[PDB]
Amino acid sequence: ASPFRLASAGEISEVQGILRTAGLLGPEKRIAYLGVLDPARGAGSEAEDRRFRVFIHDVSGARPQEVTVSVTNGTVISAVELDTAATGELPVLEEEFEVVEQLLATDERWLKALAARNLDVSKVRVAPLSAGVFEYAEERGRRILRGLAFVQDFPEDSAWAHPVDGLVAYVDVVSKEVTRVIDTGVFPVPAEHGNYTDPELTGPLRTTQKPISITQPEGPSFTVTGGNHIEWEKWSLDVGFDVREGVVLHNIAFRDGDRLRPIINRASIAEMVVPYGDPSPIRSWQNYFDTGEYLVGQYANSLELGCDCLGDITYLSPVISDAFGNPREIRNGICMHEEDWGILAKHSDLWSGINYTRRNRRMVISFFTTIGNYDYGFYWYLYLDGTIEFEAKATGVVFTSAFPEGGSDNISQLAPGLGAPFHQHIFSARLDMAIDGFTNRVEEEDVVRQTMGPGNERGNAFSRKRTVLTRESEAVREADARTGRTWIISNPESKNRLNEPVGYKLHAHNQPTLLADPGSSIARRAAFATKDLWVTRYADDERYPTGDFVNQHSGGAGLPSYIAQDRDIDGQDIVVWHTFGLTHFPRVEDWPIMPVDTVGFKLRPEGFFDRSPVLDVPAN
Amino acid sequence: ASPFRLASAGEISEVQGILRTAGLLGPEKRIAYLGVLDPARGAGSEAEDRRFRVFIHDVSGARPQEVTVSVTNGTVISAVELDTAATGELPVLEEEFEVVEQLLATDERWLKALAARNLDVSKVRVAPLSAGVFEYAEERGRRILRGLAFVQDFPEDSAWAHPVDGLVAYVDVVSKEVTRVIDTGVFPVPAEHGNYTDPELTGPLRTTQKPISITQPEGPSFTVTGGNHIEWEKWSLDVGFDVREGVVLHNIAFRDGDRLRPIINRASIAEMVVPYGDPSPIRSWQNYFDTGEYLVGQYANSLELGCDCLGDITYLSPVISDAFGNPREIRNGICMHEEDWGILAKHSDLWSGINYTRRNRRMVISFFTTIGNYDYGFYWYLYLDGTIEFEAKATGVVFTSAFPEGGSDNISQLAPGLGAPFHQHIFSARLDMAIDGFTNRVEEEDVVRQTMGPGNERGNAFSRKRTVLTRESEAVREADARTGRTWIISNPESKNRLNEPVGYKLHAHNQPTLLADPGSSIARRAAFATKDLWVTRYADDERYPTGDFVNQHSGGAGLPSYIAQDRDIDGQDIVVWHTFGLTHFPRVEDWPIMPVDTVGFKLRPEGFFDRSPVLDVPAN
């Protein structure tokens, strides 16, 4: 049995049983996070000790704990109470989100505000959002949620079309008290509806699209063994799933003839922040840490065939735990399939008379998640030529506000009186590198322009330069699209036939990074987002760029803390953290429902192979 | 019917008859370029007048002429003699390429160079490349091609694997003289073959790739009328083909309700430069102007179904003129098909209970060309949401040299002793803008970061700024990926319902531009490539960023010349020229045959529509 297989429903139940038996899961206990711990550093280590990490919250306000249980031996390996005001609060529970609207509905200040706007309280939906850490000392140690109002005229109506601006409430979800209600002024509530399903808005439906059928008469080319192990066109990997990160890929390797050579030990989107740049007090605290605070894997959708995933699809239905330890499966939550990718290589040679053409194809592993108004698709691609690529697709309904009279420098109009606060969606891919094994290093490669003169008389010469990042204090790098900056992860002791260290080159999209002022809370809490690439010495306890407990943490927690250790990264077990995102000034065509936009990165072999790894692909 | 239809065989033959009748096409004349001209500006279209422009070369050595004929009226509109030493030589003739190897084979200095290397002349292929303008005063006014040697061991051998470095010959293709033979020293000639079809090199072929059947049961969704008029999912356009530019798109328009709205009047890749960065005198003059010097449309491949173009494909077989004025058809030279493009939009709403998912698709129009060792595919994409995108695909065999013992800063090693000089593939897309008509303008949009303080107390705010480029003198812009710089083309007199000028935003990949020293011959001849964006006031004689005659032509024509006019581009008939390219540092993975690498750009609607233009897309 592989130590990388997906956690079984019975394993979750087993952790529940172990926890309750240990008396760590009473009536007031809630599992805020639960996930298996994959194998520590070993090699010939065979002791199958399946362990799970759990964050246990206490509804009575009693200190929460971080517990590690061995589902194999049925024991509690560790259990530590947490001082949340120091180390941060646990992830928000879905139940806590639910209580916000309820409480506000019976709060005088809230009802007072709704009354002044002639808004029927039973029609007002509340988006219960993370609070972060700002200037309210009373919040330290307490679990707060901040709610924003949206009018829903009827059950099937889209409330996002009707933001109630000038109003925000702060709710303590444990004592269940409305700590604050702020009403800066009445703003008219956008009247037009945004029901993209209403024929009055859609108009007659197109009858012009003919069907495109993608089939595989002989089935797929990849094989799935042990439930989540993929073998496809020389590639080898394990598809894992975590409630916090979503799909995680393990042991990405390419079989170069005889040997199965490792490339990336673990690949995942370790974080994703969505900061808002509207200076209004109503939204200036708004910053979603979808992965850290909400847990994107928890909200994974059940993908439909022919709708979400077209073609010959192979599904994985991961199992997560609920607030009480009961296993829950996300039916068809993961799509696995291979798709045509046009031309791989082509050449019509005059001298030899040989005309050669080959088609490319990509293995696709994906999942979609819904975080309130937004929906995000996470796609990992494996190409025939050895390229690894990640692509995040953003859709959903844009978060609205009112559009100020006289316009705004931080909000765009989408409809009459309907505003759309500017914001970014910034991802962090954590890549536990394993280029032909763990001894790796990273070089920053810049294009080098040369001056016309001796040795370059015609001024046509251009070169390249590579700077090795030796210590962590010099591994916080920024982009420079102008000089064609990329980053190469190589293995100093593994050379190709030309006696050069094998490698893989990371190609970033060079999108803008965190725009917020450097002294802001969000710049402190999402420092990872302020730079494009980070390199750290590997450590089993350094899993997220923002830290373990992101919710309401004061700042400096993940990457900036890890880097401060200043460890040696030159030819060591290393991890690459790549920051990449979309800076969003919503447009009229993003309303009522935003068409997909994407961001990503990819890594290509750079002297990894001895020649093209795709010479054996047939004509077809 | 449509003045935008493709030139027919008959029209070509007729142009030949008109030139002949006019005494402009006797036995010593050769057509170096022939193409139909676009209808003149202004709705004042007094019937059909199909005019063609021709560049006529004289094999006896007499001055060439540029001629415009009205194939409709059977007249010569104009015909002028060309002083090629001032205005540039005509594009290279296919026949002139054959010449080089032949002449060299009988030259004593050449045979002497070959003998010094123990190479059999009958086995030495010569790559006859464009000359450019350097320090050879004797070349002024003459049609020169420079030759580089490659050993081909047998008929089916790939000579690219065996470059003969240290040797270059200059040849006058009209007087048929070998003007120069330069030998800098013997180099070992790389021995390994690069026969990617040799079973011994490929190893047994994979038997693991199952079929991926892409079919359209009811046929395609697009219609082709009048030979080249395409109508697909609200889009409307004409697919034209020019021997110099290749596929050209005309009258790109989107049907918005009852109104056919124009977006781009004309789109084409107006130039394509491939500069080499090896300071060796053997190659320091190497710079392919594939479009301007070689003419990409003339080397377009015949695309095979199932191999090059997969799915339900509608082909176009454009007609070009051979060197004598006879028409020549390029069978299946252009592919037109629509393809699935994943998720268009997706949202699962808690509050409304509505889950919505829609698929995207794109109209693809492409062709592939072969310029000696390389092959480039040109792909234009039209998406359901109104996005217009271009993608250039680079493949084939890389241009080799010897890898110097002791390494190199401008050449990389691909095999033992085999080098690959550093180079770039830079394109220029000419976009004759028509955003809701000709009255357009361009703004450069930068993201704006804000300082924490009054009005932005929490330092989270970020904005954007737009600068209107009013005169051509301020319309030569550079990229700034750091500030998310983009360019918006709007129609100041056409507003969306929110009273905002409709527009389209151009998203560049922000790859490095021309690396050469600014004082070099290439920097001046490919000045366009030194900047990302140029905007000009439309002129019927301003068609190429490099001018009409690029072959052995110095700076003095093209964009830098047009720009000096400093015309008004603020709310005028304007043209956008976007420079974008690849910096290729050849890797071992690119040998023996290069796997596809890509580059491009796209334009997305920016307040062009009144809401998402895809609400009428059915689920089915």
Ligand SMILES: [Cu+2]
């Ligand atoms: Cu957004």
Ligand SMILES: [Cu+2]
């Ligand atoms: Cu290249």
